[PDB]
Design a protein around this ligand. Structure first.
Ligand SMILES: CCCCCCCCCCCCCCCCCC(=O)OC[C@H](COP(=O)([O-])OCC(O)COP(=O)([O-])OC[C@@H](COC(=O)CCCCCCCCCCCCCCCCC)OC(=O)CCCCCCCCCCCCCCCCC)OC(=O)CCCCCCCCCCCCCCCCC
Ligand SMILES: CCCCCC(=O)OC[C@H](COP(=O)([O-])OCCN)OC(=O)CCCCC
Lengths: 49, 75
């Protein structure tokens, strides 16, 4: 299964689960600078792509 | 210009947020919104309204008086 993996497989598999998906965020401690959820959500896609 | 991480001190406060793609943008827009407008109107009507009502009465009287004064009276 590992040998089957090449660069294309990683681009396809990662886009399936990461790209333009809503993440779950958990913060604890001095988290004033933790980005807003919308900004985090916007970090899950690229306008250039 | 100030920046996040240097604003103030906060302790023991938890915030729960939901993604915007998970919830409605207009939840109960009329079923809940109209009651809130009536609440806010009642809370401020007595502070805002009487001045402009006072203007409306002074406006109409001054215009009525100005109109009658321009009409002549028998000698
Ligand atoms: C007018 C000319 C517009 C200039 C901008 C053109 C895009 C550009 O410079 O490329 C970078 C920008 C980077 O986008 P990305 O792929 O998400 O890169 C993320 C970086 O990590 C950067 O990610 P980041 O986390 O650092 O920030 C994301 C960045 C994403 O937005 C931008 O970088 C755009 C900059 C604003 C342009 C001015 C408005 C017009 O968000 C903003 O800065 C948006 C805030 C703008 C608020 C303005 C209102 C006040 O690329 C594009 O937007 C390319 C698509 C262009 C579409 C134009 C349609 C024709
Ligand atoms: C010719 C257009 C050039 C691109 C400008 C633009 O769209 O700004 C980016 C944001 C949306 O990207 P994002 O904030 O999700 O960040 C995404 C990063 N991955 O859009 C906005 O809401 C900003 C308002 C700009 C109006 C002038």
């Amino acid at each position: 299964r590992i040998a089957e993996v090449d660069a294309r497989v990683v681009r396809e598999v990662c886009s399936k689960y990461f790209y333009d998906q809503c993440p779950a965020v958990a913060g604890f401690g001095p988290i004033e600078q933790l980005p807003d959820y919308n900004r985090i959500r916007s970090g899950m896609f690229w306008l250039r792509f | 210009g100030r920046q996040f991480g240097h604003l103030t001190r906060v302790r023991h406060v938890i915030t729960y947020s939901l993604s915007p793609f998970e919830q409605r943008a207009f939840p109960h827009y009329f079923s809940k919104g109209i009651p809130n407008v009536l609440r806010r109107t009642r809370a401020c009507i007595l502070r805002v309204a009487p001045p402009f009502v006072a203007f409306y009465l002074v406006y109409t009287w001054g215009t009525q008086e100005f109109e009658k004064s321009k009409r002549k009276n028998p000698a």
